[PDB]
RNA sequence: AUGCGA
């Protein structure tokens, strides 16, 4: 029952919404592979410009509304580039503009990596024929819009097979029994329930060994040498 | 446990809204996913 | 003649019928017959003209 | 259920699934003697003919995109960017 | 299927609900009464299991439809169960509801206003008003009848307010409110409801001491004695087996006296049907009779195997008729026979008979509810490992399909599949004939079914089928000049003829391997008829997507019959749409073995 | 309750009107115009004659034909209206829209049309031109369209035979031309529509 | 009735023959290949009921099977490990013999008769013959009897001592198998030849005694004071 | 197309007034009557029918058992898989039902 | 490939008021082209080519007053190897109601047939390569079988390599 | 002994013993006596509930049953009066079957022009030899009836009136109408009638007709029928002939000395020579 | 089910 609504939200065939975006970005795995290989795409810039020629499409939508959000939020977000003290005044652009309609509505993680690439490639920008970060960035955004997951894609099933099929190739429970222990039974009784504890930078290794002994359970049996009942 | 779900369904007087892809298969209905996520109509000349 | 491709699934009136006068009947007949003449239905049309003649007085 | 034209908010592009269904249904129509609005240009496969009709957007079909509420947007082929 | 035969009455939803014996009697095509099945070793017993009212048989027409075995859809008869019994399917339920009553008042032993409390919650959850469902608990105040009625007033007012708001706000509708969370809140509520229902170990509304109820498991309920402290307390308030009949007579009255709450207790959504909640819902006063069409014996090649239903049903008729005959024997004793304890034994026959019939009907439902490897009942028919649903609904056999061991072929496209001419001559496409395909179909007809781009059959536009299986070149020649004939019936003037043409180099086909581990393992390939082949030819590039190897692996070839499925098999399922896996998006399709060593050798700087 | 179900039988099986004799000298106004809603299929081949498509498809075979629901022989149709599948066209648009099946190229539509129906009832007094005269019935033809026959059993013994000979009326003169009769029944279980007249009421 | 049971393989009786299943006992000789025909008669099954088991320790090839079950003749699929195959040199005892004379020789060898022994424990070796407990000795006498027994086995002068007797010696072992000298001569023993070096002649060994026996695999690997065969 | 259209696809009768696919029957024809689809729930016993408090003309249909009925002429045909019909076999025994929806009702 | 058949005339053996079915004819009206396959005793000529649809025997039941035949229902043609008349273990049965017919189905090596070395390196025959197109050695021969080397790196069927070099030496 | 068995059980298993004991608990006293009285009242309720169905079997045998037969006269004091001619040949048709011309006609060919049916059967040759007196007119009428039934049986595969008519010799319409109405399942209808009268004879009707035929032979043979020769003559299954004769209630067994002598069959084959007979005390 | 191809 789990599929993509036309609004990009993940709803069940019941109608119950499960996620508001696929992985929170609505990106298709079958597209992503090169979606973050910017330099290569650039070496084949003119070809991709021939695929995603914008002049056919630049007439049907807006390339600024999201870019405007990018200006106010990109400023304040670079101002807030501590985690729980978030830029709560600005949700990500994917919340504020249909990624299919205003080119530039992209995960902030992808936006940031892309800009940082454009800055780190000013020397590639000293190797181009004339390409600029607005023309290349515009192209890569258009790759992003054209890489989005289609309305109605059976992504629930796709997920499920993507977990089953590779699990055929298969101190704590690993592999299939572990996945079973989670996915299949949601067992409140792990076979090897563990809790990882970060120890402060100041915590010496010897203090840590003292604490390791100091926390472990100690049964009376553990100290008993001999019991004689007469 | 098909019969168990049968019992709880009848006792509820449940109505199937025919959403499950499987359930819809049971009734021989175009699946609602993908190409069945929508309907197609036709534009016809009125004059 | 047994299925949808020839016969409507369902027919329902939305109000109580209206009792067309002889003159309204004749005006409909003349307009309908003329529009149809302008196909075994023609034979029923042949009967409609006789009805028209009977709605004229005499076949 | 009628989503106002002023209010249509969905992807201007034809989904792969929408395009697929359109091509099937229109092909099926021509194959059931729907009047072809494009040059047959020799072709005999109704499916490739419907593909020609898509290339010219001569297709006279409309997509009803449903929203899980049940509201829908009636879109012409002649506007949704085919690809 | 034919595209030429549309329907426009599609099912939009499915309501579930209990039948009723009077409904069955009105619809029932017949009552089957005779425990005989066949007679004189070979004849269909009148008004028995194989009465023609239950469908057509042996060239005998359906006595309810007069239709042949190949035509009569069949009709469902019915059995009038002597005494009322217990429905296995709800037996746990009726036991629960039995434990909830008062035996001197015949109400639920739970506080009436608290009950009303429940009814309120279940009404709000018909509309799924969850926040209000939690908000009801706040209504608060020896407790006067004026005060208990004041709680009933505030609660009813609360119902009216939450409804008036939600209906005003359109936050629900006349049709109720239905969501997954509403269902869950119902299961939790109905559970806490049942726990409070169980808490009363004596009546509160009436103070009465209900007996402890014991059960055998599926055929008897017993009514336990009480303690003299409770008995004498009953004086101031002034284990035995009981039949289903007494259970029905008590529970009916209890179920009516608490109909006002139970009305909302037994529906998760608004009872638009104004359905009375009847105790006869858990009991079977009658038994239906399925169509014989669906009760035919399994004859596989020579062996005729009896139907298991015939056997269990004959067991029901024998037991029931014996019990009716015992009822005749007491109707004999019953003049008066003042001291003939002789019946003290036929009365043992009555008790034994009664448990017997109940258990045997149970057996008719579920073998695992009766008392070595007995014929399966409907519960066994529906589940085990397939559940009629899994074995014939969630998966089926299919037509237009072939299976064969695959053989490699590198010279075909990577998107094609090599079809051997046996399969190329035995698979057809239902081609509507036009002015644009008249030439091709006229030639295919000329070839006939036993040649290349040929055709096995011709379906007229009148609906009739004309097989070309044995027609001569002359006969096919005559039909070729008739493929484009004019209309004949205005009933059919809109259609055009169809030709069941062989599969050819322009068709798409859906190849599926064994372990359907992922959707990428079942793709559509473009058909390429290969001469002088007998095995499915496949390009190597696909074998790492099927996880296939020519060791002996066999593949299913599906030929879709429809432009919707053709367009999907040429555009979506097609190999080109499968260059990446959705698991990871790494390409799963590339050259293999020898081609790899060939690239390593050819691309060496040493290669001139 | 048992009167909801009797309300179902009388109120569902109720008859609307009893078409009277015009001026009590004509015929019963069994001809009536009724606006309906029908549900028809549309082939693709009528994409250039869609209103006429529906006509040729469904409405043309319906004329001169009995409909159980309307209770009579369709006298003609008026005002076909395709219900647009998509709102706003003060019903008016150079093109309409229709739902296509999710399996076939066929369309399904709502339609609103006025019907011209011949809705006779039992007891109506009608006049007919004698079709035939056999010793068990009198054949007549209503409007030159509807065949009517009055069988011997429903005829007054006061009628007079003259020999398949000839009938002489109750007055004592042989019948000729037109006959005035009351409708006893209308039969429709076969080939074409049907009827039944009486001379005793 | 035996044609029916033998035609279905559903052997059923009021005692159940002390067997875990009522099917699968019969197989079609399936002569599609002479290899298959001979393969049928050296195939042995662990039984259907262990085929039903979910685990694999039953399927695990154990080293005890050396010389008795084939390490490579095993089907692939559900039966894997369930359908074992006998070694081409394996034999099956079909009779029992001269067990009556073995007590006499043991008594001569120093076994105390169980009425006289009056002792029992892991601290002492129990000499048993076919599940007839005949006596107790020191564990040292356990070893002396085992080896001298093998000498009188390979010898030809003690007819009360059939060549095919299996000499189960169990030495004393910390938490080991409970000690004893369990001889067996009865039916269904699996027996296989090995070459006894001290008398340079063939000797029949079964899988029980093999556990504690040092059998060199070839003459050049015979380790001093270790491999007896 | 695969799990239906090419397997057990059947255009089957359902009662537009009952919503069931197993009460449906072909009514028996007569000297003046063709075969007509009837729903068993939607018919009246010719022995009753208010006859004491009470005809359309065309609501009487006859069974192969010669039984006259009033009504039952409101059922139609819909595309489903034949196994669906197989379900009433078990389910109708199971004391449940289909309310097979359609257009207006 | 041999397929053996039992042709029984005692399907219902039935009470025992009759048991007359006899191989042969009576009405003459049968298609005399059946003699092209079935001898005047109702049994096919041993050696006969049989194809799907061909009559495998002809018999006569007095109840039907008809000469009936058992049709052959198979995917492939065969040849009749033996026809065996069974009167044995019977009390009288002289009417010859049981006949066993053996079919000989020739099986040519064909694309899709499985082949294996003695090393479990199994493969279907992908194609029957033209002799001219095969590779020919300087000894003037072209191999019988070609196995792809790329199978070995996973299988490590090196015993097969030694069998190749041993069979070559041992032939020479 | 069961109790003792229980003791054995007690020793063997605590748990299993518990289960059996539970069974005992389930039984309890079973019929309680006070409970029994209440139950009796319930039985009265059952009386109302009870499916007052009928005699079950007597009614079925009397009425339509495994195969229909002519109406037997259970009170007949002579076998010939069990199935009178009017039961074999309906009164309405019997009054119209006048065979006087057949008795008076000496020429076999002219008699053939008088027969309602002509076929390949030897029956007419067999019965004709014995019908020489006018007193046998009734017997001759029965001969007429077999001929008519034979025409029906051999053409039971005919599915329309005209094709059936093609096999008969201008038989009285009343005979065809009666046979089709009560011994066949007519597909009724004026729609079919405008083209022709179409119909079919189902297997149960075929069984009925065959029973009527055996009834005819039985009457003309004074209720003593040779099984073997009849089966051979009619091309019927031995099991079918036996079953059908038993439906009529005849006793079929090996010939008596008198029967063997009269029929001229070896006494040694008498036990294998099946004869059908009818007696005074009617069959149950 | 026994066995088996993958
Ligand atoms: Zn039927
Ligand atoms: Zn109470
Ligand atoms: Zn209904």
GROMACS .gro file of C-alpha atoms in nm, chain G residues 31-218:
model
  188
 1259UNK     CA    1   1.675  -4.771  -1.302
 1260UNK     CA    2   1.722  -4.456  -1.512
 1261UNK     CA    3   2.096  -4.518  -1.481
 1262UNK     CA    4   2.290  -4.819  -1.368
 1263UNK     CA    5   2.487  -4.575  -1.154
 1264UNK     CA    6   2.159  -4.480  -0.991
 1265UNK     CA    7   2.059  -4.840  -0.939
 1266UNK     CA    8   2.373  -4.925  -0.753
 1267UNK     CA    9   2.360  -4.592  -0.577
 1268UNK     CA   10   2.022  -4.682  -0.436
 1269UNK     CA   11   2.155  -4.980  -0.246
 1270UNK     CA   12   2.434  -4.793  -0.068
 1271UNK     CA   13   2.216  -4.497   0.025
 1272UNK     CA   14   2.104  -4.479   0.386
 1273UNK     CA   15   1.874  -4.219   0.540
 1274UNK     CA   16   1.880  -4.049   0.881
 1275UNK     CA   17   1.499  -4.063   0.855
 1276UNK     CA   18   1.215  -3.830   0.761
 1277UNK     CA   19   1.168  -3.697   1.111
 1278UNK     CA   20   1.515  -3.551   1.122
 1279UNK     CA   21   1.451  -3.418   0.775
 1280UNK     CA   22   1.178  -3.222   0.947
 1281UNK     CA   23   1.426  -3.063   1.191
 1282UNK     CA   24   1.526  -2.703   1.133
 1283UNK     CA   25   1.888  -2.739   1.260
 1284UNK     CA   26   2.198  -2.868   1.087
 1285UNK     CA   27   2.403  -3.041   1.356
 1286UNK     CA   28   2.239  -3.359   1.235
 1287UNK     CA   29   2.349  -3.264   0.887
 1288UNK     CA   30   2.703  -3.176   0.992
 1289UNK     CA   31   2.949  -3.434   0.865
 1290UNK     CA   32   3.114  -3.572   1.163
 1291UNK     CA   33   3.468  -3.714   1.170
 1292UNK     CA   34   3.328  -4.032   1.323
 1293UNK     CA   35   3.195  -4.118   0.979
 1294UNK     CA   36   3.543  -4.182   0.838
 1295UNK     CA   37   3.533  -4.517   0.666
 1296UNK     CA   38   3.160  -4.558   0.709
 1297UNK     CA   39   2.979  -4.275   0.536
 1298UNK     CA   40   3.103  -4.113   0.223
 1299UNK     CA   41   3.229  -3.757   0.263
 1300UNK     CA   42   3.121  -3.666  -0.092
 1301UNK     CA   43   2.815  -3.878  -0.169
 1302UNK     CA   44   2.546  -3.655  -0.042
 1303UNK     CA   45   2.255  -3.503  -0.233
 1304UNK     CA   46   2.215  -3.128  -0.254
 1305UNK     CA   47   1.894  -2.979  -0.122
 1306UNK     CA   48   1.664  -3.065   0.164
 1307UNK     CA   49   1.817  -3.416   0.197
 1308UNK     CA   50   2.171  -3.279   0.217
 1309UNK     CA   51   2.323  -3.454   0.515
 1310UNK     CA   52   2.010  -3.662   0.563
 1311UNK     CA   53   2.073  -3.898   0.273
 1312UNK     CA   54   2.411  -4.032   0.363
 1313UNK     CA   55   2.588  -4.298   0.163
 1314UNK     CA   56   2.790  -4.596   0.282
 1315UNK     CA   57   3.156  -4.632   0.198
 1316UNK     CA   58   3.226  -4.867  -0.087
 1317UNK     CA   59   3.417  -5.093   0.157
 1318UNK     CA   60   3.158  -5.086   0.431
 1319UNK     CA   61   2.979  -5.403   0.541
 1320UNK     CA   62   2.676  -5.463   0.761
 1321UNK     CA   63   2.652  -5.742   1.016
 1322UNK     CA   64   2.353  -5.959   0.938
 1323UNK     CA   65   2.400  -6.219   1.214
 1324UNK     CA   66   2.560  -6.265   1.553
 1325UNK     CA   67   2.787  -6.543   1.662
 1326UNK     CA   68   2.987  -6.721   1.931
 1327UNK     CA   69   2.895  -6.460   2.188
 1328UNK     CA   70   2.841  -6.752   2.422
 1329UNK     CA   71   3.209  -6.843   2.431
 1330UNK     CA   72   3.337  -6.490   2.490
 1331UNK     CA   73   3.244  -6.493   2.860
 1332UNK     CA   74   3.455  -6.802   2.907
 1333UNK     CA   75   3.764  -6.642   2.762
 1334UNK     CA   76   3.704  -6.319   2.951
 1335UNK     CA   77   3.677  -6.513   3.275
 1336UNK     CA   78   4.007  -6.667   3.181
 1337UNK     CA   79   4.151  -6.323   3.122
 1338UNK     CA   80   4.070  -6.199   3.471
 1339UNK     CA   81   3.722  -6.047   3.449
 1340UNK     CA   82   3.552  -6.079   3.782
 1341UNK     CA   83   3.196  -6.213   3.746
 1342UNK     CA   84   2.939  -5.949   3.828
 1343UNK     CA   85   2.799  -6.151   4.117
 1344UNK     CA   86   3.151  -6.155   4.258
 1345UNK     CA   87   3.270  -5.814   4.143
 1346UNK     CA   88   3.028  -5.621   4.362
 1347UNK     CA   89   3.157  -5.294   4.223
 1348UNK     CA   90   3.033  -5.024   3.989
 1349UNK     CA   91   3.147  -4.680   3.883
 1350UNK     CA   92   3.329  -4.465   3.633
 1351UNK     CA   93   3.624  -4.565   3.848
 1352UNK     CA   94   3.617  -4.914   3.700
 1353UNK     CA   95   3.594  -5.067   3.357
 1354UNK     CA   96   3.277  -5.261   3.288
 1355UNK     CA   97   3.306  -5.545   3.042
 1356UNK     CA   98   2.981  -5.602   2.858
 1357UNK     CA   99   2.892  -5.828   2.570
 1358UNK     CA  100   2.592  -5.736   2.355
 1359UNK     CA  101   2.445  -5.545   2.642
 1360UNK     CA  102   2.492  -5.837   2.878
 1361UNK     CA  103   2.703  -5.692   3.160
 1362UNK     CA  104   2.953  -5.960   3.248
 1363UNK     CA  105   3.210  -5.798   3.469
 1364UNK     CA  106   3.442  -5.530   3.602
 1365UNK     CA  107   3.820  -5.484   3.596
 1366UNK     CA  108   4.082  -5.215   3.637
 1367UNK     CA  109   4.111  -4.972   3.350
 1368UNK     CA  110   4.460  -5.110   3.300
 1369UNK     CA  111   4.301  -5.446   3.256
 1370UNK     CA  112   4.071  -5.265   3.017
 1371UNK     CA  113   4.365  -5.195   2.792
 1372UNK     CA  114   4.527  -5.534   2.839
 1373UNK     CA  115   4.202  -5.707   2.745
 1374UNK     CA  116   4.144  -5.483   2.445
 1375UNK     CA  117   4.485  -5.550   2.297
 1376UNK     CA  118   4.514  -5.916   2.386
 1377UNK     CA  119   4.165  -5.953   2.257
 1378UNK     CA  120   4.267  -5.811   1.925
 1379UNK     CA  121   4.554  -6.060   1.920
 1380UNK     CA  122   4.319  -6.352   1.983
 1381UNK     CA  123   4.088  -6.203   1.724
 1382UNK     CA  124   4.349  -6.205   1.451
 1383UNK     CA  125   4.465  -6.545   1.572
 1384UNK     CA  126   4.287  -6.857   1.448
 1385UNK     CA  127   4.280  -7.083   1.755
 1386UNK     CA  128   3.984  -6.950   1.954
 1387UNK     CA  129   3.672  -7.031   1.751
 1388UNK     CA  130   3.452  -6.873   2.017
 1389UNK     CA  131   3.586  -6.543   1.883
 1390UNK     CA  132   3.446  -6.434   1.546
 1391UNK     CA  133   3.661  -6.204   1.333
 1392UNK     CA  134   3.382  -5.947   1.310
 1393UNK     CA  135   3.353  -5.869   1.678
 1394UNK     CA  136   3.387  -5.500   1.754
 1395UNK     CA  137   3.596  -5.434   2.064
 1396UNK     CA  138   3.461  -5.118   2.217
 1397UNK     CA  139   3.732  -4.991   2.449
 1398UNK     CA  140   3.653  -4.671   2.637
 1399UNK     CA  141   3.949  -4.553   2.841
 1400UNK     CA  142   3.899  -4.348   3.157
 1401UNK     CA  143   3.868  -3.984   3.066
 1402UNK     CA  144   3.805  -3.666   3.260
 1403UNK     CA  145   3.440  -3.589   3.179
 1404UNK     CA  146   3.468  -3.832   2.888
 1405UNK     CA  147   3.239  -4.105   2.768
 1406UNK     CA  148   3.150  -4.339   3.050
 1407UNK     CA  149   3.427  -4.601   3.055
 1408UNK     CA  150   3.382  -4.963   2.965
 1409UNK     CA  151   3.469  -5.245   2.731
 1410UNK     CA  152   3.151  -5.290   2.526
 1411UNK     CA  153   3.196  -5.572   2.279
 1412UNK     CA  154   2.945  -5.614   2.000
 1413UNK     CA  155   2.875  -5.904   1.768
 1414UNK     CA  156   2.507  -5.856   1.704
 1415UNK     CA  157   2.325  -5.765   1.390
 1416UNK     CA  158   2.332  -5.435   1.203
 1417UNK     CA  159   2.684  -5.344   1.309
 1418UNK     CA  160   2.864  -5.145   1.043
 1419UNK     CA  161   3.202  -5.297   0.986
 1420UNK     CA  162   3.498  -5.202   0.773
 1421UNK     CA  163   3.838  -5.360   0.709
 1422UNK     CA  164   4.167  -5.213   0.820
 1423UNK     CA  165   4.507  -5.379   0.825
 1424UNK     CA  166   4.629  -5.480   1.170
 1425UNK     CA  167   5.003  -5.433   1.168
 1426UNK     CA  168   5.128  -5.648   1.458
 1427UNK     CA  169   4.988  -5.956   1.288
 1428UNK     CA  170   5.002  -5.793   0.944
 1429UNK     CA  171   4.655  -5.919   0.864
 1430UNK     CA  172   4.317  -5.777   0.793
 1431UNK     CA  173   4.095  -5.685   1.087
 1432UNK     CA  174   3.734  -5.577   1.092
 1433UNK     CA  175   3.667  -5.256   1.284
 1434UNK     CA  176   3.339  -5.082   1.356
 1435UNK     CA  177   3.265  -4.716   1.415
 1436UNK     CA  178   3.234  -4.741   1.790
 1437UNK     CA  179   3.579  -4.880   1.856
 1438UNK     CA  180   3.724  -4.663   1.582
 1439UNK     CA  181   3.678  -4.352   1.795
 1440UNK     CA  182   3.969  -4.456   2.017
 1441UNK     CA  183   4.179  -4.624   1.748
 1442UNK     CA  184   4.484  -4.480   1.574
 1443UNK     CA  185   4.454  -4.582   1.211
 1444UNK     CA  186   4.731  -4.446   0.993
 1445UNK     CA  187   4.602  -4.350   0.651
 1446UNK     CA  188   4.911  -4.481   0.471
   0.00000   0.00000   0.00000
